């Protein structure tokens, strides 16, 4: 799923097929450096696009003076009783009125939806 760079000329390693041992070989076009593939899959295309933005929001958003705050929902990892919540603010806005939270305690940065 990732990418492979050549170890000699630092370029993009293409996948190739050899008719001897039935194993995927990654080859270079400039040089002909070789090696075998460990996962033996090339292409993947996610159309659902249901990526949870809990992996994209940053912990320093709790320094924003223009975001609402809450005393109801406390943090689990530290027990702080003050959070700051917001919406998806991104694409995939068909049914996007969820409410992600971020703890505001210094050096906690814990994030969670509900």
């Amino acid at each position: 799923v990732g990418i492979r760079f050549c170890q000699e000329c630092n370029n993009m390693l293409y996948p190739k097929e050899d008719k001897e041992n039935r194993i995927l070989l990654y080859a270079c076009r400039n040089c002909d450096y070789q090696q075998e593939a460990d996962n033996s899959c090339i292409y993947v295309n996610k159309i659902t696009h249901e990526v949870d933005e809990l992996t994209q929001i940053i912990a320093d958003v709790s320094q924003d003076p223009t975001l609402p705050r809450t005393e109801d929902h406390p943090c689990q990892k530290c027990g702080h009783k003050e959070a700051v919540f917001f919406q998806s603010h991104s694409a995939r806005a068909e049914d996007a009125m969820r409410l992600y939270y971020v703890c505001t305690a210094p050096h906690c940065g814990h994030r969670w939806t509900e």
Partner: protein, 134 residues
């Protein structure tokens, strides 16, 4: 250790003259070049530009050896001069001015794709994908 409790004081001089101009030769750490493997080197100004401005051409080991191209930095003394500080047998320090900064990079002596030929190849390949469709 002496790096922790080490103490000393040495004199510094800045001679108004030198027998040779001093330059910096910089290498990417990521290459981790073994200088011991350099049995010999040749060093000449680059010929693409056909002097003091010329980029350097470094050829390691005389005949059979490595090759790098050195490209001059934009500035070296535009705001602050750079000095080479060297230790002398008397313990005193000697400072040497840096004349220039050259950037040295590794070279790929493999593969030669050709212009007009490459473009012609691309169109045929592009054409081939369009042909025999549905």
């Amino acid at each position: 250790g002496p790096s922790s409790q080490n103490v000393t004081e040495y004199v510094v001089r800045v001679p108004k003259n030198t027998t040779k101009k001093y330059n910096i030769m910089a290498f990417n750490a990521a290459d981790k070049v073994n200088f011991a493997t350099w049995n010999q080197a040749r060093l000449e100004r680059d010929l693409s530009n056909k002097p003091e401005d010329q980029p350097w051409l470094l050829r390691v080991n005389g005949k059979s050896g490595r090759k790098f191209k050195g490209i001059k930095k934009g500035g070296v003394t535009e705001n602050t001069s750079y000095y080479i500080f060297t230790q002398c047998p008397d313990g005193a320090f000697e400072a040497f001015p840096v004349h220039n900064w050259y950037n040295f990079t590794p070279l790929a002596r493999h593969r030669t794709l050709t212009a007009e030929e490459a473009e012609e190849e691309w169109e045929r390949r592009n054409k081939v994908l369009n042909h025999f469709s549905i």
